């Protein structure tokens, strides 16, 4: 129960991280807008990155639920 309780907290933290990271990536886009080839490659990278975070964001929630159920 101690570990399961820890699992819940750990998962929650991860979700928070992904939230902040998602916020930071958005801030990065603002500055990117503020070389065409370089910026183009960047824009795609953050686009691809964004998608990655969302999926991982879903996983974090999914795990948190698992941890909740596992208790």
């Amino acid at each position: 129960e101690e570990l399961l309780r820890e699992n819940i907290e750990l998962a929650k933290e991860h979700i928070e991280i992904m939230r902040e990271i998602l916020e930071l990536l958005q801030k990065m886009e603002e500055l990117l807008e503020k070389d065409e080839d370089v910026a183009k490659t960047i824009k795609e990278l953050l686009r691809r990155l964004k998608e990655i975070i969302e999926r991982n964001q879903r996983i974090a929630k999914e795990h948190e639920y698992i941890a909740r159920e596992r208790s």
């Binding site: 070389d35 990278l45 990655i52 996983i59």
Partner: protein, 74 residues
């Protein structure tokens, strides 16, 4: 299906591990590409420098989460 939950969680963490590696490498890629971008404003480029290393740190910490979570699950 209690064992189902353990198996389910274990699979997800494997996937999530894959994601953080892919993300970290992307961020690394960005830092290199940014430095190659002398054309942009130096101050703004630095800001992204500070921002990215903030993110990179969080991904390191996230990796520590997984490492820990894997211990608990194991």
């Amino acid at each position: 299906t209690e064992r189902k939950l353990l198996e389910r969680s274990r699979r997800l963490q494997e996937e999530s591990k894959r994601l953080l590696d892919e993300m970290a490498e992307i961020m690394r890629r960005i830092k290199k590409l940014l430095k190659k971008a002398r054309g942009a404003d130096e101050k703004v480029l630095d800001e992204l420098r500070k921002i990215i290393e903030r993110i990179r740190e969080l991904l390191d910490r996230s990796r520590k989460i997984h490492e820990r979570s894997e211990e608990i699950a194991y």
